[PDB]
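debug: dumping io for the single-chain case to check the tokenizer round-trip. Nothing else runs in this session.
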Amino acid sequence: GALPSVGVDELDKIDLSYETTESGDTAVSEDSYDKYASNNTNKEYVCDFTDQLKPTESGPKVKKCEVKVNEPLIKVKIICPLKGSVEKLYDNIEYVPKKSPYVVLTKEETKLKEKLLSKLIYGLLISPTVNEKENNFKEGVIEFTLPPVVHKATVFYFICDNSKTEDDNKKGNRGIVEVYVEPYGNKINGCAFLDEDEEEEKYGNQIEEDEHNEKIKMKTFFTQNIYKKNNIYPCYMKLYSGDIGGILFPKNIKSTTCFEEMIPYNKEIKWNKENKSLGNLVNNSVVYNKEMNAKYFNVQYVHIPTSYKDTLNLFCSIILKEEESNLISTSYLVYVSINEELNFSLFDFYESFVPIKKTIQVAQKNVNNKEHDYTCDFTDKLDKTVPSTANGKKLFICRKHLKEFDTFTLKCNVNKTQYPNIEIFPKTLKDKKEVLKLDLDIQYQMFSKFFKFNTQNAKYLNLYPYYLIFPFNHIGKKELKNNPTYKNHKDVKYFEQSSVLSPLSSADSLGKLLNFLDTQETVCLTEKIRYLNLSINELGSDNNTFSVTFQVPPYIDIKEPFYFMFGCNNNKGEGNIGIVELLISKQEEKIKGCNFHESKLDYFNENISSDTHECTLHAYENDIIGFNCLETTHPNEVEVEVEDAEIYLQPENCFNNVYKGLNSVDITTILKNAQTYNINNKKTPTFLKIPPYNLLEDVEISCQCTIKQVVKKIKVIITKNDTVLLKREVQSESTLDDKIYKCEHENFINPRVNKTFDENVEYTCNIKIENFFNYIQIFCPAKDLGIYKNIQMYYDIVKPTRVPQFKKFNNEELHKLIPNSEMLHKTKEMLILYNEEKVDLLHFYVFLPIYIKDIYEFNIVCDNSKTMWKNQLGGKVIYHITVSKREQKVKGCSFDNEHAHMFSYNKTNVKNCIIDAKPKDLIGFVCPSGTLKLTNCFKDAIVHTNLTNINGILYLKNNLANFTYKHQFNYMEIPALMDNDISFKCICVDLKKKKYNVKSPLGPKVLRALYKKLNIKFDNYVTGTDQNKYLMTYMDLHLSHKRNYLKELFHDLGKKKPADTDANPESIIESLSINESNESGPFPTGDVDAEHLILEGYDTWESLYDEQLEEVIYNDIESLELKDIEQYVLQVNLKAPKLMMSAQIHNNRHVCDFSKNNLIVPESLKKKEELGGNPVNIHCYALLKPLDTLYVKCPTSKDNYEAAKVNISENDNEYELQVISLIEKRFGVVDTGPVLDNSTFEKYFKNIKIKPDKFFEKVINEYDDTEEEKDLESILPGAIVSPMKVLKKKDPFTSYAAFVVPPIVPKDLHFKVECNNTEYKDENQYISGYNGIIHIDISNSNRKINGCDFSTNNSSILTSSVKLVNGETKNCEININNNEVFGIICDNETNLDPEKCFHEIYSKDNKTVKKFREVIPNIDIFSLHNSNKKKVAYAKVPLDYINKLLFSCSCKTSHTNTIGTMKVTLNKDEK
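debug: decoded output
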């Protein structure tokens, strides 16, 4: 509802029945109206009617005065002749209104009607101290003031009707003043005191934005809205050269010291505390409504002129009338900064440690030139000044923030006849084009504890203007001296407290400043930014000045905001030092550009190689058109010249000259404020910044580029204001990276430049979850003062229930919507000494339960379209999530009715559950909300007295245990790899004394309390080495249980009341110390790694734990005994089926031999038939190394067993029998029973099969419960493999299969194989055949070794590799000495020569081939020729042979003539 302002009087009373037409009673057509504009002189509009409205014509005439306002802060003055000054001429004049100027005339679709100006125009100021008379007309002046920001184009009429008088049938002239206000300006930089109360965040589109309700528009009038009982935050104003600020004061103010008795905050000179108005501090500053006399709304506007080009800071105290109700502060402070553009300056950073005499300046915004031309003039600020007064030898610091299409120009006076010696800093500015880049890391470190800021937000510290100019530096020192990270810096010495025993001389201060600026790193201009338009002019018009002029491109290729400095040092001549500290912002928007070139930049919206010849671009207001016609793969501006010759751009310059139809016209005619960027030493890419325009027709602009006789056309249709602009949906799809969902949105929440095209766009990412164990990463920050001031995180339920009302979304709503759903955060745990953890607070992770009963579909809204940051509008992201009905449960228990639907097995409210876990099962662990997590299950469990990490025992890599140890619900996948039978207990603690809210994790303090409480050894524990790339930790949403530093800092400031007349705001705010407690983690100095101190990306040090919750936990522990502590225990016991380790005959050589009658033959159970026999998976655990081989013997499958019974008469060779001597006799589970015979072999091994049928030529991944058979060569090439082949012909029973662990293993391997019989069954049915499953677990390595990989020209395993080509001989000599290992890899076409290499080798002659054992009897060769491949081999030379040896092997195509030769040497100059 709308409630009018102060209303009814005898001069403001409105009526709704008065109805008069625009023509009135004169009956004159509007077409024949004699109109002209109001006299506009020096900001003042006057309609002078003293000589116009005179009865001179027989008939009436209409003279209209048009007052058209587009410039803020005007004084509307209307002068029509006095009532009855002369008789018979001014006798019967009438006025509409006679109650003007408070009430005006509005057009109700046909009629002029009386209505108050305050309702359509908010911020009006009419002084009742000049219009107290009943009729303002006896003075003959109608005057009023209009606010500087209006959002409604309103028209009103004033009428001095002189036609009702009659002097001998002569009619007078009726004067009409037409006041028409259009929207100019968006928001005043300032504050408004709202008498209303704060209103809760209206989620979604339920916001009702009415302009009839004055309350709603008032909230949009200033940048700060001060509620008396909620807003503690001091008022702030920022004014630039030519800006307009103000304050809307309340009605309960008693007195104020702002704009008339301001306290100057001066750091350049010593403290002044006197009261000083804007008039004495600033010339030509204009203040409106000073006495606070206006009746409707008491707002004071201050217009700061362009004459002031110095930085000023002022403080104000607004004391409110002491009222009965409680308000946060009866006196509020106001900080007004005038003409400063860069906040958190490094000079303010320096002054808190070393005093600095300086004059900070803004670049001169040129009015006689283009708006985006700015200059800093050190010609008149580089004088020779010896320090004798506090003005001698000052620092002129010129600060200016450049944006899109903005250019800067510096001028120094460098002549030697006025200055004896002057230097330009740095020295490398001229020749190599480098600058002294100012990095913002030090301000990050000093202001890390003053806010909650990460690595990305701290670089935007130069973007936040509200309260970063306070003397916080004087406090930050204490924090900088408190920060254990800043101490280890090389740049500490300049921020150590200066000498006070002897007063520091300014010369030492300036020298220290020069060294502090010198130690910083230099960066090249041409490399940090791409396509810069820069000119270094050492010569002027009289050769007495130096200049540097650089134009900021439209899109900046800086990786991060380019914050640097330069200037001219003249202190070497005992004078001034001129310095410019400048910052270029990174434009975060895609350029609407036609890029036709085949090679294209990565930020052009139209990516056309040769697809389209004509590019249709509809350009809008504030749009950025790009036109590229050249190579983008050239970051230089020297070699791009060769392609400017092959490009023909029409017109010769674009978009300077542009095609309308087919004619070439200067672009400035259609767009007066257009900005064209033409790159130096280039023709294209050219750029057009479409300024604010005013068109009624789609204007077609056109250019064309001819590349290699191909003409491509850009036809940009700059639209009008009334073109159809519909909601544009940008759909992106979920991308599944490492079982976590990611969407490609990086700066679509970050505020970007406002545009009409920037409002009807919505970025929605569709995320479908149809599987288990996948984290849905949602990225939108927590609420903090800056580019994220009013971000909102709410959710709507589409399916199953359709509730279009937007509700709050937090950890609780997500926990309740989906059973046991978890909001988790990605952290990499710190050591116990630190107790902080690197959490990613901008990104959280939705984790869905293993079991899903209802299909859910929702939309998460991260809203930053309400945060307007310097006329830049942020984006909004919609995540359309669909969570499918997934039927998967965990084995275990639930200790209440909360997780019972998660477990197929449940013992509700039963403390200790015992579970037999079998190979590849999937166990879940979860305890009720409020019970204390004792275990890091399933990373760490309890063995019966001790804390033990069950991972290293069970080969538990590649398991959910490793990442699920800090959730509410933890998961674990049983492997087939076991070194023992292990019974552990996953125990959560129920302290019956007190339940908790354990959303935040439990600290090592209380976990040690429970270990010593529950007899759990934290001294005999093998540490679980951090194998996790991450941890999704279960914690509160955005640490809402933890403290908030911004609000608490400003809360202490507001209750410290720095806004009293006698109060000095500095000495009060310096007394503030940031609220900090044990809810935190210290930083130990010494390390195991440096990383526990530094942060990069999106990680920040925060305590996961709640020290209050922790102390309550420790209390309830120490006060109770063991009887009063419930233990929700899952006792998981794992039975490894007959653990066999592979018989390691050599360091390189393991063996899994199974030619036995107790192994696959089902063991003799109890004499009775038990049941359908269950496969006893015979467990061979083979632990090998890079360059290890495993041989595996099993009984021979019936078919090949017979085939070997055939060739029993036939013998092996020296090779195979040799290997035999090396293996069979060289092979717990060993036989004692009957000797193998053909009968029992055929019986028990009738049905023995071997999967994979080719062993190690295909394999079975052991953590793959699908037993997904894979070509290991496809996963790990570089192995030597013999499939399952019969050991001996004479013995039909035993076969073997071998494989080699390659030396470079890019990763851990964990697979398994099976000489599986379960098909043979005991005829008494004890057990089916036993399955011999060998579980192979190989470790990784990446050390390239001597060896020739003729399969590639870059081996990732060997050092040398020159891939062979048929018809080409490729020699690869490698130089080996005693005790060095080598290899060789031939491709499929070239087979080994010899095919017994390495065992046989060409002689030194390369004529004869010899068994290498002969020459060297201790060589360790790794190769098998009982294989399907004869192209890959490896070996090691022994430790005690040094006589000069030479040999070679070759990869020879059996078909064509191809030779890839490895030449192997030994030692060097020897026998």
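debug: round-trip ok. The chain is about 10% helix and 30% strand.
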